[PDB]
Design a protein around this nucleic acid. Structure first.
Ligand SMILES: Nc1nc2c(ncn2[C@H]2C[C@H](O)[C@@H](COP(=O)(O)OP(=O)(O)OP(=O)(O)O)O2)c(=O)[nH]1
Ligand SMILES: [Mn+2]
Ligand SMILES: [Mn+2]
Ligand SMILES: [Mn+2]
Length: 430
DNA sequence: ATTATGACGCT
DNA sequence: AGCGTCAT
């Protein structure tokens, strides 16, 4: 009743750039704009692997994780842009630099948590309080929410999509109590006004479009963001959760799309998020552990407490390359040459990071995969990272991995290596 | 040959 | 510390 917490304390947004790498290439090359187009890494094997897809191309069935030759079968007019290659490997610097452009704009409105190269969470609770005091109690005009959907509306008592969006927004605004500065629905609405302003600034100052979700926590904001892409934002209220979750497959909620979610489905014999409400907290903890059980008990009621961490910069700076099939590394000279290539890219990125961000990494993580192992990483070992020098880092990585060569010959490497990975970690202020 | 990154939990 | 999971 009056003591039952409802998880409505915060206003949280999730901003995700639409088909980011594609947009970066479309800004650079206007010939690619408003076209079916995709971004690929490499080219010789099956035309390269697609990693990002414009919405025009998605309409033909093109998807990430598809070979370009196969995508061209679905979409013969598909346009392609290739990721830059430096030192023999894909180099993602252009997209990291574009990401910094967007993150710095978002940080003007509120403190952000960089969740990926193209998405960030935003804690808007305080900004919403401020804008509400600036409002002095006037309602919010629909004109302030020109790209916002209200999930679950319209309802009850109409042929076009924009008209649907506007009907739902009108129903939502008509039911707002704008006199209560602590109304969670009002707070979410003001949050959506601010996110309209943030997205407008991003597009004005970079050319890039994005989608966003606004709700009371990170999981609901992420889920909301996906409901109406591209170039739109969605408000998911606390009240919208029972209907939304009643037909939501469990795998759609962030962290449940893998083995844990499959086990929730199998053990409990359910399909949808809302079905979780029928279990006690102790029942869920008994199946899925104390932490997961409490998280699921609260999540299926729309409640989640994970904070938006104040972190705009990545915690790690890494370099990795797969060597699939017959390109696996089988000699010592090969392994050394590629460790050097990775370490040279790492040195360049670390030196730029030190100048930009006033910090130094102190630990080097070396990971490899050996032929025949299904796991991503066959081995991870750390060593000290005391100087930003590529030859030193590559010799140190070789030292930590050389015991993995089971060949009796000094020159050959067996079993051959199908992955190398160098990662700089444990940053200290400098 | 579903690649190149990231974050975070477990023990 | 080293390994696994999840995202995409
Ligand atoms: N190198 C590499 N980059 C990836 C991979 N998967 C995604 N990316 C990059 C390219 C995407 O443009 C970018 C952001 O990913 P998202 O999942 O948010 O998708 P994207 O922004 O492409 O489309 P969206 O409109 O958000 O559905 O991350 C991958 O497997 N390898
Ligand atoms: Mn995106
Ligand atoms: Mn995507
Ligand atoms: Mn994203």
């Amino acid at each position: 009743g009056p003591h039952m917490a409802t998880g409505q304390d915060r206003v949280v947004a999730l901003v995700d750039m639409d088909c980011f790498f594609v947009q970066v290439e479309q800004r650079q090359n206007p010939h690619l704009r408003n076209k079916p187009c995709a971004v690929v890494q490499y080219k010789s094997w099956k035309g390269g692997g697609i990693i990002a897809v414009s919405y025009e191309a998605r309409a033909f069935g093109v998807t990430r994780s598809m070979w370009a030759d196969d995508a061209k079968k679905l979409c013969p007019d598909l346009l392609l842009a290739q990721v830059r290659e430096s030192r023999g490997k894909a180099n993602l610097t252009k997209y990291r630099e574009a990401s910094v452009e967007v993150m710095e704009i978002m940080s003007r409105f509120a403190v952000i948590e960089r969740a990926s190269i193209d998405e960030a969470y935003v804690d808007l609770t305080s900004a919403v309080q401020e804008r509400l005091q600036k409002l002095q109690g006037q309602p919010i005009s629909a004109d302030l929410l020109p790209s916002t959907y209200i999930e679950g509306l319209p309802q009850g008592p109409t042929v076009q999509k924009e008209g649907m969006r506007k009907q739902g927004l009108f129903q939502w605004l008509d039911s707002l109590q704008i006199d209560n500065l602590t109304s969670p629905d009002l707070q979410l609405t003001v949050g959506a006004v601010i996110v309209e302003e943030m997205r407008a600034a991003i597009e004005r100052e970079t050319g890039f479009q994005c989608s966003a979700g606004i709700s009371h926590n990170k999981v609901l904001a992420k889920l909301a963001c996906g409901l109406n892409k591209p170039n739109r934002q969605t408000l998911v209220s606390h009240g919208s959760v029972p209907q939304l979750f009643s037909q939501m497959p469990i795998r759609k909620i962030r962290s449940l799309g893998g083995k844990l979610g499959a086990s929730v489905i199998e053990i409990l014999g359910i399909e949808y998020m809302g079905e979780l409400t029928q279990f006690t907290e102790s029942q869920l903890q008994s199946h899925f552990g104390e932490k997961n059980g409490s998280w699921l008990y609260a999540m299926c009621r729309g409640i989640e407490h994970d904070p938006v961490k104040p972190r705009q910069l990545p915690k790690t700076i890494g370099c990795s390359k797969n060597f699939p099939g017959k390109t696996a590394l089988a000699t010592r000279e090969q392994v050394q040459w590629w460790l050097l290539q990775l370490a040279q890219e790492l040195e360049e990125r670390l030196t730029k990071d030190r100048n930009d961000n006033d910090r130094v990494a102190t630990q080097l993580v070396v990971s490899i995969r050996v032929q025949g192992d299904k796991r991503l990483s066959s081995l991870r070992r750390c060593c000290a990272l005391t100087r930003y020098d590529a030859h030193k880092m590559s010799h140190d990585a070789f030292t930590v991995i050389k015991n993995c060569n089971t060949s009796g010959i000094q020159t050959e490497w067996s079993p051959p290596l199908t992955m190398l990975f160098l990662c700089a970690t444990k940053f200290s202020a400098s």
